[PDB]
Amino acid sequence: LKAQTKTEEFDAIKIALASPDMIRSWSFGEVKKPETINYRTFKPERDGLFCARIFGPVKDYECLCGKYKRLKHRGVICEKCGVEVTQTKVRRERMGHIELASPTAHIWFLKSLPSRIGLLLDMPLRDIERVLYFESYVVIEGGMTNLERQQILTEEQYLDALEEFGDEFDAKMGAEAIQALLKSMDLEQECEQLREELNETNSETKRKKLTKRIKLLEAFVQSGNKPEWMILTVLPVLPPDLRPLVPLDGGRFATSDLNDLYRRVINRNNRLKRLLDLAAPDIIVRNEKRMLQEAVDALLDNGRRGRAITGSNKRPLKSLADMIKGRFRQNLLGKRVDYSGRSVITVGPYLRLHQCGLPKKMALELFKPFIYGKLELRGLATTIKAAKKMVEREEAVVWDILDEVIREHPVLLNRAPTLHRLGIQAFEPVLIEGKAIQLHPLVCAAYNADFDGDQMAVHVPLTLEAQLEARALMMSTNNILSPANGEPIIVPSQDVVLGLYYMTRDCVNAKGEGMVLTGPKEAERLYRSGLASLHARVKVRITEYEKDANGELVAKTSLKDTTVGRAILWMIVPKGLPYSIVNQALGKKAISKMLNTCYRILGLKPTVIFADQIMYTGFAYAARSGASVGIDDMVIPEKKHEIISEAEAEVAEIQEQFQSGLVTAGERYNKVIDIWAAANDRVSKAMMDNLQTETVINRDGQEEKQVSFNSIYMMADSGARGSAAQIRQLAGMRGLMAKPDGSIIETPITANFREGLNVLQYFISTHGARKGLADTALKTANSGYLTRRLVDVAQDLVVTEDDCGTHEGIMMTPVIEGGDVKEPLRDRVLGRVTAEDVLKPGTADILVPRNTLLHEQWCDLLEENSVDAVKVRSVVSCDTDFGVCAHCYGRDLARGHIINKGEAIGVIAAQSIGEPGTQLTTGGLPRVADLFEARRPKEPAILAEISGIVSFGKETKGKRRLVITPVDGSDPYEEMIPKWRQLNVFEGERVERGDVISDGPEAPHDILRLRGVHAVTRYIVNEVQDVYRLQGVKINDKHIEVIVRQMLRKATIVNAGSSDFLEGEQVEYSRVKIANRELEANGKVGATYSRDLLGITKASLATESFISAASFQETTRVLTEAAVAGKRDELRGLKENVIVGRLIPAGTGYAYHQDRMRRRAAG
């Protein structure tokens, strides 16, 4: 096989220092003049910052002088001006360089927080600078005299030390010195010193810093970089079109600020080159050198000195470093895209689930290149030039052609805050008149789209893949379940659930009461003819199906006891569902679980076509219902004024007690709030008693009352719109308000919205409203910063291996919070795969065997027996190094089957957590951050460190020591405990390691250390879920568990035999190497470690790929600290593969990277 020279498909990216020899390879000339363009002719002065000899021709294939203008001449250098005739594009590629007179320090390696030039020398920054500005000499290889190597001298001292040792002793000042220091420095020799020093002196103050430095040093030898190279002899210049000098209208010019920065460096360098041939006094050339140092620094990274200002303008100049940022996460803010558009969105309830209304005009412009081709592919246009003039003329036939290109061609729709993956969904386009985008009403819930002015954007899948990706992955009908909780995200929303609740309803005596109907068909015939009422108790012969056979629909026919409305709805329910699913009252509650069961029983397609029919019929009968809302619909209880006066009486007595000194002011305010709080609860469930049932009606007899049919009640009872907390503010009094500082005002708002509020009440209602808009505005921000921190710790996590093969898993129970089951077992365990065989109340009997995916049948076979706990494989335990086995993860998706290889569960975990983040409230959304950031609480409890009988030692010295004493092992553990914090440990009781020695909150860091990995992962999920489960948010523990896996990504070594002693590193890398040690290598020299809990942002900080880190971390430090290591980025990951524009190593691209990672490191 031949090697290669030119250009094939690159893998990996290496970064390093640039030798001055390296820097001249890129340059195609030295810039020697500060000139830009000429000033009359706007041509570029030769040997200037803009130049045709150095960089490239101004216009395509035209020499600068003009003797060679023809496109024939290409690889030709004009004999006058050193210009080859190629495209003007090379003025965008070709770089230059400048030969510096005096050496110049690279600001980044001198000044990025840990000074590389500093600790590579073990020299302080206030000293290096003092040597760099010529204030004091430094010795270099001082030899056997009176002075050390890194010793620093002054003017007078150097003179006194020169008269004693003339030669055999060398001391310089300025950049030439620091260059010599790094040059004369030997890395391997200093390595051998740091290795003998580590072993000779045993001291934690000695060998804690010793190890910290040496890892960079020998990384530098191995890096290949040379220490002299942090001193710049050659400064490369950026191609001009990347800092251009384009003209504007009116003949005014604009240019990148670099040109002021590059010009200055050249001028001061040229002036310095002069000051040497003028043999100037050192006092001047020193000042010039200092300015050249300053000029270069303001070019590379302005801001780390005195911040030079731009010409005539107060603003500072944007340095090269700022070309890269422009503060944090500045390369991934977004990019504008061809084949796209947006407009206002409106309804369109006629739509099938998999389609969307696209304007005649938008679809025209968007598919323009498809129309052009499809036009002359059929011959309706001679050539493309006329094809344009056709669709410009909008001839009638281009419309009929547009349908042809549009048909099997999905489009993407995106709404503003893209929270989870459902924010972009692919639909099939329906050509519509008007300028509005028509959106299917069921997919509204996913997008969080109202129709109050919200807009959506559109995108065209161009390539064949993207069309199939949009069709098979992003399609509306392929994502009907939320990936945060296997429940349907395509629920009927409001307008529709009112319709079905109105249908599946019954009133006491209605037209048709008691007749018997052959089937559902004659039941719709009875209603559309005005004979039977939609709600009348009525027996109808129905047939239902049940697939209780081995995959076969058993039929059963009976006279079920239902109503006329529920009869007609049965005509929609598909095949194998029980008639019981519609026999009830069908609110939004019951109407979604109806939809769920259809998916779990009949499958995807029959569920999609179901949801459509539920919406069509829901809209229709909701519109037939004539449901409205008038002023008399908000029924105030007749007993309201009574309740008010009564609590108004109690407070007058609590006041009576306060006057006489019987009760305190703090008690009064507290006791008065309680009787008002009670009165609001009393008015509340007074109006709801009246409102709900007072419809007293009559059937053949006297009286009988039922659930009301009043408009505003049905809206709430069904679940369409409205909530009992809100209704209470309309009829009953509306709450107690909070005055600004946080107190709740002791006289509540007695009035409501059906009455008026007065000046004082409304004025007090204001603060709650404004702090409401602010709180909900801010908690929309905090969420968005959470999902960032969350994908930054995940992102690269992909379902890679099939089955890691483990029995390790967390023991799953119902949460049972104090009172009763705050979360069943069936929910926590459904969709997960069992770790080992589960047994009946009696054994010998496997009920589900080993790793089976516990779905709805298994969960019932579990719920039939009395199984109260199931060990479940979890992501935090998946033994796959670099990723997650498909088994240990679970099943969940917008589809119902076990996760497929390659899906990027890292992202979709993080998304599912931060998407509901808006709706939370210590507690609240920061309480989530506190957990995921692993933040230690202020006043923690201490846990029992080691097992054994405990006792107290010494006395009060600010710290009261505790001495534990194990039965067998060593007992030297003594902990200094501040004894002004009340303790809970029994002072003569044997304490188990991990028990309460004091009370109060606990640090997760302990939990992981003492009680284990399985305990901390349990502590997080149950504690964050308490935040979500309190707000009524369903997030599967799965997603929190993948975040936790990233939190304990790292470990710290305890024993050795191979690598370091204390370093922190990935269990993936460590476990991969002590598994490499149980055989091969040594018999088992393997090291032990200890899992380390990191907060998400601390865990995200540790990324191998520096391109990923230069995205969100501080770009200077990442680039410097990586360039000194000569670090290689192998790509491999997600973030970077986006930055460089290639296939993601997941999804459809997962097959590509798997075929690539194997050809690599092979032949």
Binding site: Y39, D60, R252, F253, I283, L317
Partner: protein, 467 residues
């Protein structure tokens, strides 16, 4: 830190000169330059080369400006004054028969009058020291071949070397000494005796034994350094003067220290051209040399688009006029009002006024909510739009199909007349030489091919590329 401080602090240590100390330095400056001038006058090659270059001036191979700028106290005087130098050289050359030292005194006299161009002065200075590199070149080869290679101490090698440094008295006569360092010099005998040719040759070109070759350019070194040492000494005393002057031209578009450095170069020139005998205060004489270099620099490197000085004074005319015209009117001048008050072609004001505006920071924040910068909005006009490049790939296949609908030699004559699928287009005569029958014959092949394509059957495709 910040260089302004440490420069201010560095030169603040330098002490102001007394009104007497100014003369002490200008005297030491006098000595050093005069010392080298006496050493330049003692060099025979410096006399012959100055005569070499004047035999070039009388043969019209140069001008009198290219060699001299005047003597002590133009074509008339130069021809006879050069004969005086020629006369004084040719009498000295022949009296070496030792006692010549009385007449070599006069050769320096007539040579110390010549004020050459600074270009030529440096060359002769370069000629002398490069001639000393030639002397030392053979000096260090004999040292490395005797001491390092043949193991010979340096105490006995330089003994008979002083006063000689050319012959074999130190080489082939010191091998017969039977010393422990003697018999070993035979190994390199073949290597040293052949390289001695370039050494004793310098005694011929320069006409001086190697002894004299150092003696002269050593006093020239002593004198040359003596001047600069004093010249540097003068500059530092006035670094405050440059500061105070540069403090005036501050915000004109150039950094502060950039000014006090360019002024510091004006102060450097002032020390060179200063003549203390004219009694004018060195401070006031440097004021013009310092204020020159500042303002002469602002003209060059204060602009991104560099403009000539006559433009900068043209510009100020408009600004000073538009300060008057502005208030003097109450509105302000139209581009054709100061056109009259300017002697300029008065339409040039517009063209002048265009380029006077410095270019605009492309990183100017434009003021949006996305903090959009100006440069983010300047579109690429050099680019060919894909909806066009698409048709270019189509106009290709169009003309290729239409050209296969011609007679075979009509393609090769059409694709030759236009640039199609060939390098360059061909003059119809050049096409004629390719095709035997030439000239008018080809013009009809050209016309008839466009004629077959112009009838609406082959045109139907091509015509739709016109709009």
């Amino acid at each position: 830190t910040d260089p302004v401080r440490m420069y201010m602090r560095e030169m603040g240590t330098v002490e102001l000169l007394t009104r007497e100390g100014e003369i002490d330095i200008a005297k030491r400056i006098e000595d050093g330059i005069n010392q080298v001038q006496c050493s330049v006058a003692e060099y025979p090659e410096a006399i012959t080369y100055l005569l070499e270059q004047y035999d070039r001036v009388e043969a019209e191979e140069a001008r009198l400006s290219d060699l001299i700028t005047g003597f002590v106290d133009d074509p008339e005087l130069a021809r006879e004054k050069f004969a005086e130098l020629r006369a004084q050289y040719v009498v000295t050359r022949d009296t070496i028969k030792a006692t010549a030292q009385e007449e070599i005194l006069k050769l320096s006299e007539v040579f110390k009058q010549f004020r050459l161009v600074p270009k030529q002065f440096d060359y002769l200075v370069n000629s002398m020291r490069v001639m000393m590199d030639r002397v030392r070149t053979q000096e260090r080869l004999i040292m490395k071949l005797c001491v390092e290679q043949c193991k010979m101490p340096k105490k006995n090698f330089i003994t008979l070397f002083t006063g000689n440094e050319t012959s074999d008295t130190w080489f082939n006569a010191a091998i017969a000494m039977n010393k422990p360092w003697s018999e070993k010099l035979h190994d390199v005998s073949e290597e040293v005796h052949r390289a001695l040719q370039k050494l004793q040759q310098i005694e011929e070109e320069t006409g001086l034994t190697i002894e004299q070759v150092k003696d002269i350019n050593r006093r020239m070194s002593i004198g040359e350094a003596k001047a600069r040492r004093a010249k540097k000494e003068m500059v530092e005393a006035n670094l405050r003067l440059v500061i105070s002057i540069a403090k005036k031209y501050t915000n004109r578009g150039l950094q502060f220290l950039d000014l006090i450095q360019e002024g510091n170069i004006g102060l450097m020139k002032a020390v060179d051209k200063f003549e203390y005998r004219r009694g004018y205060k060195f401070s006031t004489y440097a004021t013009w040399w310092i204020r020159q270099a500042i303002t002469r620099s602002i003209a060059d490197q204060a602009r991104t688009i560099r403009i000539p000085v006559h433009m900068i004074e043209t510009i100020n005319k408009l600004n000073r006029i538009s300060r008057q015209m502005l208030q003097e009117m109450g509105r302000e001048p139209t581009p054709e009002e100061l056109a009259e008050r300017m002697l300029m072609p008065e339409d040039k004001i517009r063209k002048v006024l265009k380029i006077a505006k410095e270019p605009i920071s492309m990183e100017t924040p434009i003021g949006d909510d996305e903090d959009s910068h100006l440069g983010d909005f300047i579109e690429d006009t050099t680019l060919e739009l894909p909806l066009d490049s698409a048709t270019t790939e189509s106009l290709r296949a169009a003309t290729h199909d239409v050209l296969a609908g011609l007679t075979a030699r009509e393609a090769k004559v059409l694709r030759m007349r236009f640039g199609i699928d060939m390098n360059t287009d061909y003059t119809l005569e050049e096409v004629g030489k390719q095709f035997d029958v030439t000239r008018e014959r080809i013009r009809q092949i050209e016309a008839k091919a466009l004629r077959k394509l112009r009838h609406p059957s082959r045109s139907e495709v091509l015509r739709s590329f016109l709009d």
